[model samples]
Target: MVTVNEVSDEARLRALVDRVTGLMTELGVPGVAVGILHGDREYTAGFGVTSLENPLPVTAGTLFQVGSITKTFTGTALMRLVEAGRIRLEDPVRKYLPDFRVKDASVSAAVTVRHLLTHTGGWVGDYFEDFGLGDDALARMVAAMADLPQITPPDTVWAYNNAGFYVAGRIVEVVTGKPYESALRELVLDPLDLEHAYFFAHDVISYRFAVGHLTGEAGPFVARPWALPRCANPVGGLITSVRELFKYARFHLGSGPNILSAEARRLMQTPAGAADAGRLMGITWFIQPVDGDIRLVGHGGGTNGQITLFNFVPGRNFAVCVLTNSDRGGAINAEVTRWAVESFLGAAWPEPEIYSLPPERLATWAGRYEGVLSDIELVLEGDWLVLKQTPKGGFPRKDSPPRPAPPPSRLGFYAPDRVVALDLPLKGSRGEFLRGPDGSIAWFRFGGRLFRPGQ
Candidate 1:
């Protein structure tokens, strides 16, 4: 059997670095850092300058905003409470936060901790507020969730829910009688010895950190307002280096750290609900079927111009972390993840074949689908289906002028209801059309959020 160590010699590592550097150039990315773990061996490296304006060499210790990947950390903290019998996963969320409300009294009363963890809470997940830096920030965010409309029934569907994690963080605070950050530190971060993980800008400001950048007409420019609101800390606020993320991956793979018991780790990695073709949702992890009998478990995070990809192959005891500072980082991150997996694990995810449906049949899928910060429109143009994504002028969107919409990309079918992008920016990213009880197309699941069709 081939091993990551056997193939990851000095020569091969340099080749991998060269390949990533070339991708960074070709993709208009300013910087990238990658980390890998194979059995007992480890590798971490960074390439390109941290910022184009104030260029500083990115190193293994360079910090970047981890975005929604912090949800996994939040999940781990909640699981620790479960292990100690402090809370039960199946208990109603109202059991912890009695005032919890989300535009539906029934859902507010019935939603469980499991629903929040699995993103089955059914409420609009993208709601954000800049509740100040007081210890009550998460509390305020949870209270604000009362206005978020329910998008699906409790325990009925899976949609990426940031607000749900905020509520979970609040539950952590209430259960432990400490602030969420304090409880999280005591429960997960400190035990794992993640010396580099941090939740606030003040702490991260002292480190060698990479600033996010967006590509303008002239060239890549820095992303303004480097930190998200303190209230959002529970949703996607951790800033850490790739070495720490590698440690996180190891802990999840049952190889490093004792924060989670073997059973709790298994539960987090096990699929609780369907996400898309070849993908499933665990506690907070996205579980992908890599090859026969092998499951790839991980999560990705996008905060402004920074993008992160962290995945581990549980069967092979292997993991990879890729971080980049560019709005175009998605393109770079995707290719790097594929390269690392195929190069080390010797198994590749099967590419979804591009299939076409009749143009007239495509009309059924044409409509305006609404999400929190973005809306998608699909139209049948001649014989091809075209998709256009528009920013909805919200919190982060308001931070900058609305970005010009990219050229409408052609869509190809992986199945009649499953669509994949066929061009740049979102090439190979998949979306699926979900059906209603009456057999009509009811919802579009794209970019890990549910977009409901408008009248």
Candidate 2:
């Protein structure tokens, strides 16, 4: 049996916190909050400026938009309803919302509540557009549904669809005879005694809320119109602080009262669908096998400016919650996790390093690129560049992968455009750049396919 050393654990925890603070600064993140729950004990910390303009310092009480992490709350509520015998996972959605119909009437009519919960609904993720629509947006979106085609037959494939969750929220309203927000409060929040967390838009700015900052073509700017539409509330609009989120994580780690039955909770942790080769989904939470042995069930969320991560390892009784105001500061999640593992589990981890490239080289890499799944565009403003990848024929979206340590080489000359190629092994071989007939620098590829530079 493996036993953790108490003295060593405490020292490592402090060290990890310090390392994470350093990473937040290196990433230019304005504000960040981290909370860790181990067994019955917990620790929380904050670092960096909450706002560069006003220059407010971040603290443990700083609030952040939890984004899709709200899905776990929504899923838990659905399970509560199931426990009361009010609903069944496999029940056809038509039983509650008979008028529900997708562009493909046959498939939409056959979709069940399980499909919505599992994100197997054929509806494409029109998260920004569909959810961004005003109060009557759901009605308008449904009316225009005939124009939008379904990506696949319901339950035949698993695609992340915000519309499906919206519909699930609507189902909660139908079954409980109450609004989605009210149902969530009554079932989950109230029971868990989480007074600090809320699902509405107004609550975010009323307290010590962390403002989201983005670095891209526009340089570092605060995201305007941070409020989310009501329709999208179930998908991404929940807000909470690191302290409150720790309570939620603790419940998942089995240290608190059973919000969900042991069996039902197990089902929630079981794989409902395959995410990648090794990753799977149980209900709404993602289950990823990390370091080959441990399974991590977690989710990452991002909106206009804010990014959040919630991860828990039940086997080790460890959980991590990271909330950030600035989207550019997302790397804190990985750094914090690495610190936690190395400290608590004595796992070896690497430190993050910074790399600086020339301004001209960064400019060449700025352009739109397309891929089989989506169209990604990069634009340079100053030292920082913004990347937006949107599905074809839809509004562009943001990409928020944790920034990794910079590559070893620097000052090496490469193409005039496509600076990302410089990081590649080949001296002049750009990962996705185009060349001329004479093997000279010609036009570049934009979107996904190779194309003329200007085009």
Candidate 3:
């Protein structure tokens, strides 16, 4: 297959596209756009159709919902304010928007700007409140945050916090006295020269776009039909083309003089908190150290049925952008990204998989665990562990098709803490387990939210 550095070899490049297309075909991905930048070399290509109904051939210009990768731009937009001396990352949210609240007054008082950016506010992050389309959507949504339960103490753990970004977006509006969309354009997108990127759904109607697919018993159907509420826009409502996204990624590499100063760009790329035992997070970017000293600073995005992957290695000035229309996008996103990174960059990515546990040990984590995302069941199947997840709010309940044995080791959950299978897609992400007072497994945390054992 054609590697990233071999883009000039037209014949070999065809193989790269073919490989990607083959993977998408197998996964039933409706549309996919891929862009890769290797050193000074670059490649942009699209395969599959834009939709199952219209069957328009996918092109590089196809607009796909970037989902949470929007958070990176949001983080940078906040950095512009930070650079202007208008906002400080360490400042408490109350300083800018005193109305911001939580169920716990102390936690609300304790949550700072950086805590929200780094997703350490420790609230149930997956809660979604549709405030309808209006100028007051985000403000009302932030005011509603007072009703949310605080799962853990502020700034203690790294869970993906959508609500935090919602608040950050509101801060953008308050500080700039402009709408989030207007401020994002003036601060981040316009300055970075990203013309194809957009925050509102109506604005993207002029271009070709991919609609999200939700597989059903009869077949796959279009999902939601539009972007998330404007309230959550800064957190996940970005719509962009693969080529344009790669161009935006170049800004993170310090490609040239940017709107923000050098230090500000560095801050946006540096970790504001710990993402995992080995991973660090800066602003909205998930920072992982791969192959020693080589850092993969990037973020993954998910919408109703769409998912996007954007990542770059600093030293190499390399990045890959993948956007998909199907709910199964996560599976293809991971596999395609792994292949591209390894083949083009000559790097070995880590695979953190689940390991089988003994009956007694499995017994500890066996009970049903509930969260805003799903109801997870850790099952005992033939002296081994089998995880299944029932459908829940917002998240798709489609079970990924079966794969190989997963090669789970004898080390149980700790050997590799993350899991993904045809039967359980919710467990398909990285998670941390907590032991209770008696020292048995008590909770699991993923996507920046906590899942407690059912009583």
Which is superior by lDDT, 1 or 2?
1
Q: List all candidate RMSDs to the true structure.
A: 3.6, 9.3, 4.5
Model 1 clashing residue pairs (backbone): none
For residues 33-145, could you state the per-residue lDDT of candidate 2 as single tens digits? 77777776677666666666765666667778888788888888988888888888898887887777777777776878788777777666554454343445544444444
TM-score of each: 0.94, 0.74, 0.89
The positional error of residue 411 in candidate 1, measured at the CA in angstroms, is 0.6
Whole-model lDDT per candidate: 0.81, 0.64, 0.73
Of the two candidates 1 and 3, the one with more favorable TM-score, higher being better, is 1
lDDT of 1 at 455: 87
Q: Write the per-residue lDDT of candidate 1 for residues 61-171, one digit (tens) a residue.
A: 889887888888889999999999899999998898888888988888888998888888888888876777889888888888878888888766667888898898899
TM-score of 3: 0.89
User: Candidate 1, residue 280: CA error in Å?
Assistant: 0.5
lDDT score of model 1?
A: 0.81
Rank by TM-score, highest first: 1, 3, 2
